[PDB]
Amino acid sequence: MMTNLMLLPDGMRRWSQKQGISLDDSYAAMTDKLVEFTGWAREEGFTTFYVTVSSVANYSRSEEQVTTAMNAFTEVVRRCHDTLNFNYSGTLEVVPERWLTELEALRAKSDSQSDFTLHFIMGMSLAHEVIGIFNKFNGKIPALTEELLAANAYVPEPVDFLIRPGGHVRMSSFYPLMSPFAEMYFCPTLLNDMTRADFDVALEDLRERD
Amino acid sequence: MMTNLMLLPDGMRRWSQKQGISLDDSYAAMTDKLVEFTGWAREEGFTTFYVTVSSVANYSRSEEQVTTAMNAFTEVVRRCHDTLNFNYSGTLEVVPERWLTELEALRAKSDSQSDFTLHFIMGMSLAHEVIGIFNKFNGKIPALTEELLAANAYVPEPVDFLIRPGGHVRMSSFYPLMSPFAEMYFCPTLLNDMTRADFDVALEDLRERDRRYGLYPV
Ligand SMILES: [Mg+2]
Ligand SMILES: [Mg+2]
């Protein structure tokens, strides 16, 4: 029975400024924090933990900025893939090949028998998502159905809860297409400053709406 | 630089409970409030004021509830259409045809030369929107382009700012397809309790935000 959580990581540049460290070191703190967060989500019973790694727009950051971020996200998977199920999706054509190749090999040997999945979405953008689905089925089916759309969306199931730390109240190209009933939670805390208590009080807020 | 604004109306049933009045009278207050809000948005220089009238799910309400709501939204347009440009879009097949006929007549009588547009989206639901676009172009084009998608989405441009009163921190069926970087503002105030000051401080919050569009500052 799916119960799933989506995180929109944010605040690494601001944290690097706050701490007086490089962007690389802030993204290293992000890797550590996302491993923590993945374990919190698993402990809390979520069946999939979705992490929005990147938008299409993000890949127009500088080459160094893209490498910093993509390496830091991939390092989460290097550390976790042997003890959870790893999957990924998105507008893969904008993801630099080096990261796609590495993430695919990690996916291929990840722990497929795990009841818990870490799922990365890369290159998020509703317009690119819809264009890809259209082009796959164009002329090949009589009509698009809700089932076929759900089976081809980047996020493969409805998202129950979405958390965005870092102070910005916006989706920034990360909205999950097939989640009309998702509950959203925003907080100012930068991702790298989030504690388990911060996560727990976010879940109190999210769970106490229903 | 030009900006637009979208409002997600919410809170009519709770307001009827709070005020001790019928749902119909709460929707009458909503009509009054939306006429106010439309004027505030125009005064603030927004090019278009978008109102998310309904989701597809809304049309599973009772027939009386649907008529009450659709009449109350249409009354907004009856009152203001003569001095602005009115347009509408959405999953129109789920809207009872009476309202489509009246709204089309009001659009025809509205001021197409106006520098301000009131735009209603009805039957919002991204799955239905996408399915409608697919079925329109299926087998008729070699590939879907961003340009064609933008020209056929319910909301005809990216939305800069959207406001959701009523306390729910969620987008329901109302997230605008072609707005990756819309700023969202939520507040607990029920729509029918919102004052001009409430609107003004929402705009302070929205306008102060640093919009980055997925990039870092240069
Ligand atoms: Mg950021
Ligand atoms: Mg409501």
Side-chain angles (χ1 to χ4, degrees), chain A residues 9-14 61 164 168 170, chain B residues 212 216:
Chain A
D10 202 22
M12 264 53 66
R13 178 185 56 91
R14 281 166 290 159
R61 290 180 179 187
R164 182 179 178 149
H168 286 289
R170 57 190 183 213
Chain B
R212 294 196 275 274
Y216 279 172

Side-chain angles (χ1 to χ4, degrees), chain A residues 109-126:
Chain A
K109 66 177 190 169
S110 69
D111 184 8
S112 62
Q113 67 87 35
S114 178
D115 55 15
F116 176 75
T117 295
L118 171 68
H119 184 120
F120 278 3
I121 312 93
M122 294 175 288
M124 292 195 79
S125 164
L126 293 174

Side-chain angles (χ1 to χ4, degrees), chain A residues 61 135 138-139 141 170 173 183, chain B residues 138-139 141 144 170 180 183 214:
Chain A
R61 290 180 179 187
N135 289 345
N138 180 22
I141 58 177
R170 57 190 183 213
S173 207
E183 294 289 347
Chain B
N138 180 23
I141 58 177
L144 187 64
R170 65 194 183 209
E183 296 292 345

